[PDB]
Amino acid sequence: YGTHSHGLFKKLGIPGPTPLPFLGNILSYHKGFCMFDMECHKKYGKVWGFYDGQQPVLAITDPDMIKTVLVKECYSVFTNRRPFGPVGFMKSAISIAEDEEWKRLRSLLSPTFTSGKLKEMVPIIAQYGDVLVRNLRREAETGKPVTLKDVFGAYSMDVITSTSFGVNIDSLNNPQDPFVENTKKLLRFDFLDPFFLSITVFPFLIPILEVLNICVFPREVTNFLRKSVKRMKESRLEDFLQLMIALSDLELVAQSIIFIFAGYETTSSVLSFIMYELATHPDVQQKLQEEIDAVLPNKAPPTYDTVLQMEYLDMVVNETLRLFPIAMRLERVCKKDVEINGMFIPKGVVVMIPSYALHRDPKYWTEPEKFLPERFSKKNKDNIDPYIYTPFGSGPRNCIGMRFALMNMKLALIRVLQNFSFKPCKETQIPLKLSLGGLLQPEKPVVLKVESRDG
Ligand code: HEM
Numbered sequence: 025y026g027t028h029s030h031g032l033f034k035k036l037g038i039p040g041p042t043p044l045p046f047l048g049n050i051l052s053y054h055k056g057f058c059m060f061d062m063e064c065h066k067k068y069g070k071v072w073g074f075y076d077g078q079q080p081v082l083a084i085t086d087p088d089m090i091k092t093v094l095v096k097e098c099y100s101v102f103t104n105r106r107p108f109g110p111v112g113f114m115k116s117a118i119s120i121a122e123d124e125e126w127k128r129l130r131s132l133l134s135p136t137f138t139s140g141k142l143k144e145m146v147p148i149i150a151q152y153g154d155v156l157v158r159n160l161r162r163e164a165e166t167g168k169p170v171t172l173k174d175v176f177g178a179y180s181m182d183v184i185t186s187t188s189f190g191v192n193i194d195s196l197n198n199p200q201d202p203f204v205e206n207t208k209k210l211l212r213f214d215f216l217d218p219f220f221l222s223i224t225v226f227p228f229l230i231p232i233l234e235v236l237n238i239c240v241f242p243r244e245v246t247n248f249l250r251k252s253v254k255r256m257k258e259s260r261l262e263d264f265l266q267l268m269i270a271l272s273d274l275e276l277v278a279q280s281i282i283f284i285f286a287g288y289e290t291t292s293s294v295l296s297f298i299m300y301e302l303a304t305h306p307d308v309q310q311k312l313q314e315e316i317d318a319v320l321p322n323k324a325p326p327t328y329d330t331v332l333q334m335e336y337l338d339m340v341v342n343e344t345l346r347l348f349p350i351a352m353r354l355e356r357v358c359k360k361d362v363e364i365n366g367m368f369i370p371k372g373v374v375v376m377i378p379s380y381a382l383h384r385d386p387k388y389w390t391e392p393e394k395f396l397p398e399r400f401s402k403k404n405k406d407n408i409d410p411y412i413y414t415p416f417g418s419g420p421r422n423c424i425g426m427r428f429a430l431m432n433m434k435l436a437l438i439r440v441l442q443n444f445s446f447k448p449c450k451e452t453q454i455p456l457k458l459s460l461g462g463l464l465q466p467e468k469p470v471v472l473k474v475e476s477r478d479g
């Protein structure tokens with residue numbers, strides 16, 4: 025048949041686009057995720073409904089409901105995310121753990137992310153602020169446009185190794201065949217490439233793949249890491265890794281893989297967006313570059329706290345994310361039958377939350393296409409609704425590495441700005457771009473001219 029749930033958002037009354045027999049609505053994804061989420065916002069109003077193959081997906085918007093699913097019933101009903109491809113042992117990674125397994129793993133690794141262990145960690149990261157700048161000499165010193173994610177990938181990689189395991193290398197070009205090479209390969213998934221597009225229409229295909237040990241995390245890489253943490257529990261007997269020292273032994277390898285997975289590519293992608301918004305906005309760059317020099321007496325190493333008080337930095341961050349919430353949705357699975365401010369939702373239904381849309385809904389933002397931080401200064405800062413600006417989600421299952429991500433990103437900008445300036449040039453294609461893949465990302469990679477500030 026192929027149309028199981030296709031008559032749920034007529035009969036229950038929710039509006040929406042109308043499915044084809046086996047595909048449902050996936051053909052809308054040629055725009056990518058965002059655009060379909062917008063277009064439907066305009067169209068079917070404040071709540072709507074659609075089918076990813078025959079998985080029925082319900083969008084929401086009113087913050088009151090958002091909160092009731094994202095914070096409130098959160099343990100009761102609405103705890104797991106949607107399952108995806110064959111996951112194998114990464115089944116026990118915290119982002120993919122469900123229900124009580126998740127509750128266990130959460131409050132356990134929470135301690136690992138407490139500020140404290142973070143300020144304990146900043147010195148390590150600072151270290152790769154210098155390394156990043158030294159090797160950005162030889163991109164400027166060679167006066168040729170500069171591909172940013174190439175330089176920020178190595179920075180993430182460098183910070184990802186050290187914080188996660190201890191291994192302290194300058195992958196940043198240079199020693200680029202140790203260990204860099206597995207991590208280099210842990211790339212975020214494109215849920216619009218033909219593999220997952222298949223699996224969505226063919227959910228029954230997943231258990232099949234399960235058996236053939238086919239797994240969505242490249243086994244080459246998982247094997248390697250699984251034996252690297254082997255090597256180390258041992259060696260050390262005579263850092264997130266050590267930090268984790270019931271929590272299972274071979275569960276630890278799942279988390280630390282996931283910590284790399286989430287951290288590596290998102291950090292370098294956001295970072296290079298920021299440096300896109302400080303070209304053709306040298307006016308923001310200035311307020312910041314100056315803001316910096318004032319907190320950091322002409323070149324001075326950033327500290328944990330020098331960071332937290334730089335809240336024009338903190339402003340450029342938040343607005344950059346406003347535009348580019350890398351997880352263009354938060355998405356939660358309805359445990360069971362439940363009603364949420366008069367709207368009722370049946371078991372097995374995906375409750376979705378169009379973050380990137382919301383983050384441009386002319387209702388909570390104005391001239392909402394504009395890069396302009398002053399939304400995030402006090403006087404604008406705290407009028408806008410927490411369940412609308414959700415770039416790390418909200419409620420128990422938010423980004424457990426939020427502060428860390430933010431710490432580490434700022435930490436990088438400071439050392440960068442406080443030495444350099446970033447202006448357009450050839451290929452710095454000024455419109456903006458934006459992939460029609462299922463990853464939120466440029467399309468053409470952002471490349472800039474980088475002129476040294478006296479050096
Ligand atoms: C670039 C900055 C980052 C962004 C925007 C981001 C975004 C997110 C979002 C939106 C979620 C889901 C939130 C929700 O369901 O409400 C999430 C979950 C998660 N993030 Fe991040 N993340 C970032 C950096 C990091 C890094 C550095 C780590 C390293 C530990 C990390 C680890 C995780 C984990 C483990 C989860 C799932 C935890 C759970 O589901 O209980 N993230 N992230």
Ligand SMILES: CC(C)(C(=O)c1cccnc1)c1cccnc1
Binds near residue numbers: 353
């Ligand atoms: C993939 C992962 C782990 C994640 O849990 C996630 C990402 C987007 C939406 N929902 C969940 C993630 C990805 C990027 C940053 N943090 C976490």
